[PDB]
Structures are given as structure tokens and as C-alpha cells.
Amino acid sequence: PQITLWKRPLVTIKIGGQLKEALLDTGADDTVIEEMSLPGRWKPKMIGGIGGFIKVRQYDQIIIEIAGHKAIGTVLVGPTPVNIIGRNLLTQIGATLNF
Amino acid sequence: PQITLWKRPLVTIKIGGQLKEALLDTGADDTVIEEMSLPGRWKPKMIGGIGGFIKVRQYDQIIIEIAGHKAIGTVLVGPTPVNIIGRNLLTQIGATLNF
Ligand SMILES: COc1ccc(S(=O)(=O)N(CC(C)C)C[C@@H](O)[C@H](C[C@]23C[C@H]4C[C@H](C[C@H](C4)C2)C3)NC(=O)O[C@H]2CO[C@H]3OCCC[C@H]32)cc1
Ligand SMILES: [Cl-]
Ligand SMILES: [Cl-]
């Protein structure tokens, strides 16, 4: 699809068996999901944006379905009010910014 | 252009006659630029980033060129890890997300 930017670019995702709403975010290097359990190994990470940093858990090799398109990659889990699909997974679904 | 997301989508902007680098950020509602001098009056705004809430200076109706495309709109001035072009100006330059 072609998604307009008149509104936040929100899509449905599936991760860890759960359906969630997430923001397609070209400004995010990495994907950041609100607190949830994921299987496997993880390690701590700090990520920074406006207002400073948050601590997250980094899970590698996690599959996400994004608006119907499957992708695999690293997923960060931590205290965000909105799920963020970052560039590491946007590339895998072929997303581009066009103007 | 059609911009892929394997690297950060950085562009050159021109504001106040000065060239700056900025990130095209579909996860940003607003445009936020590092401390600089702009004309006219400003109004207060609180924005909530991943790390918390910060105060910025809101300048309305500012002339800004983004990757060669002319825009005139609101610019927030304050401490950001990188200059970000948010949806208020991405819509002026005609940007969409596509996959
Ligand atoms: C290394 O990988 C990472 C490291 C950092 C992040 S980041 O911090 O989230 N950020 C990175 C940017 C700031 C370089 C993505 C950005 O797109 C956020 C995204 C985000 C994501 C959720 C929901 C909201 C509030 C915050 C949490 C930040 C928008 N937007 C935002 O700061 O926007 C403000 C401007 O205009 C206003 O709109 C409304 C929100 C505040 C400002 C993500 C992955
Ligand atoms: Cl990855
Ligand atoms: Cl590609």
C-alpha cells in the first residue's frame, strides 16, 4: 500500500502470538515493542531519543508479521507507550519513503 | 525520490539561509531542530519523546527547504539527538510510505 502521512502511519503487527498496533517509523534505527515476554536469550541495551534514554531488552532473531509481511530481526522490548517498527524491519518488507 | 531505509534517511535542509542535516522521521508528528535563531515570536510546547518530556520553542510559519522541496510551517527548537523532519512538513513535501 501507499500510506499517507496526514495521520500517524499505524499498522497491525503480530509478534509472539499477539496482535498489536505499531508505528512505521523511519526515524527509529531499531524496532521497540512495549513490555511483553519473548522466548530465548536477551541482553540489556540503552536507546536514546528526545528526552533521553530508556533501558530495553534486546532479543535477536525474532519473527514479526507487519501488515501481512513476515520479517525477522532484532526486537527491543521496553517501556514505550507505542510499538515502533524501525528501519531494521522496515527494510525487510521493502518500505520506502517517496516524494 | 524513492528512499530506502538501509541507512538513516538523512537529507539537507535550508532554514534561515543555513544548510543543516536532518532525519526524515515518520514517527514524529512535529519537526524539531537544534538550538538556532529564528525570526518572530515563539510559543511554548511540551513534547514527549522516548525518554521523557521536554520543553521546546514553537515557531510558526517558518520557511524551510527539505531536500529541495519548499515548505512553510511550524518548527520546534530544542534539544534533540538529531534534527528531525516530522509529518507536519513531510506532508507539505508530498511524502508517503510505500511497500
Ligand atoms: C535505536 O532505536 C531507536 C532509538 C530511538 C527511538 S525514538 O526516540 O523513538 N525516535 C528517534 C528520533 C527522535 C531520532 C523515533 C521518533 O520517531 C519518535 C517516536 C516515538 C515513538 C513512541 C511514541 C511517540 C513518543 C515516543 C514513543 C517516541 C513517538 N518520535 C518523536 O520523538 O517525536 C517527537 C517529534 O514530534 C512529536 O511527535 C509526537 C511524539 C513526540 C514528538 C526509536 C528507536
Ligand atoms: Cl535486525
Ligand atoms: Cl531494497
Ligand code: NA
Ligand atoms: Na533470540
Ligand code: NA
Ligand atoms: Na532566538
Ligand code: NA
Ligand atoms: Na512565526
